Design a protein around this ligand. Structure first.
Ligand SMILES: CCCCCCCCCCCCCCCCCC(=O)OC[C@H](COP(=O)(O)OCCN)OC(=O)CCCCCCCCCCCCCCCCC
Ligand SMILES: CCCCCCCCCCCC(=O)OC[C@H](COP(=O)(O)OCC[N+](C)(C)C)OC(=O)CCCCCCCCCCC
Lengths: 70, 55
């Protein structure tokens, strides 16, 4: 089911009478970034999404530095 | 002694299963009606603009 493109996915659910290919331009989505091919849900495959922490550790250790006795 | 339906009338309904046979017929009515089933994932049920799904 996830292969269904999100624009049409709302039409197949009887939530709209206007198919996504019949939208008037005043209503469409205009993006500044490329819209590549649709990608389904990727479970059970190596392309599965992996969560990770986007924040650096809150403590920064000290860089070893030595100056000799004067 | 104060029952409207005579003894024979009550016995015929009792012995011949009058209500069960009526119960069977009404079930058979539904056999000639269109089932409500839809075919997922080839079709989806309705959704509303207020539907709460994936964040
Ligand atoms: C597979 C083969 C087929 C097998 C099934 C055969 C089907 C035919 C069945 C034949 C035998 C059934 C007998 C039914 C005839 C008598 C029924 C009858 O008259 O009712 C009993 C009667 C009760 O009197 P009642 O009607 O209650 O009067 C007061 C009303 N408030 O009581 C009486 O006073 C009269 C009773 C008569 C007794 C002799 C009979
Ligand atoms: C000479 C005449 C010959 C008739 C031959 C046939 C007789 C059959 C039995 C009659 C008596 C009877 O079904 O009785 C009902 C009995 C006992 O009821 P009770 O304890 O007396 O309670 C009732 C008390 N009253 C008198 C105050 C009402 O329980 C039942 O509900 C049994 C349910 C059986 C369901 C079977 C379904 C099969 C369907 C087949 C086709 C699809």
């Amino acid at each position: 089911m996830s292969e269904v493109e999100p624009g049409w996915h709302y039409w197949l659910a009887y939530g709209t009478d206007v198919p996504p290919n019949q939208l008037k331009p005043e209503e469409k989505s205009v993006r500044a970034y490329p819209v590549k091919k649709h990608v389904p849900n990727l479970t059970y495959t190596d392309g599965a999404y992996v969560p990770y922490n986007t924040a650096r550790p809150k403590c920064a250790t000290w860089d070893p530095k030595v100056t000799e006795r004067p | 002694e104060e029952s409207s339906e005579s003894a024979l009338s009550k016995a015929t309904k009792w012995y011949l299963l009058s209500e069960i046979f009526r119960g069977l017929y009404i079930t058979l009515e539904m056999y000639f009606r269109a089932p409500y089933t839809i075919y997922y994932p080839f079709e989806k049920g309705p959704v509303s603009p207020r539907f709460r799904g994936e964040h």
